[PDB]
Amino acid sequence: QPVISAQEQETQIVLYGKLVEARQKHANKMDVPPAILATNKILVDMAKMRPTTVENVKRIDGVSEGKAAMLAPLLEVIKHFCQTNSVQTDLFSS
């Protein structure tokens, strides 16, 4: 019945919270509402699929090329978090 591990489930929740804060942080810097920078739905997808690149984050529903550039600090949060812990990134069919 379950598809992911209990640890994967934890990881996604923890990363999601880091992305929420990162979203609030940068959206402020850029003078955009956080939801305009990235919706919660986009943040969930980023927590599950964990892109670390502009090309990979463009593979997420709702992310354009120019939006990908705006989401760059969030990609940094992902790659660092996954490095510190020991978690696979870029879960795409590549």
Residues that bind Cl ion (CB under 5 A): 17
Minimum CB separation of residue 19 from Cl ion in Å reads 9
**Residue 30's Cα: distance from chain center in Å?**
18
DSSP per residue over 7-57, as a string? HHHHHHHHHHHHHHHHHHHHHHHTT--HHHH--HHHHHHHHHH---SHHHH
Minimum CB distance to Cl ion smaller for 20 or for 54: 20
Minimum CB separation of residue 56 from Cl ion in Å reads 22
Minimum CB separation of residue 64 from Cl ion in Å reads 26
Residue nearest to Cl ion (CB): 17
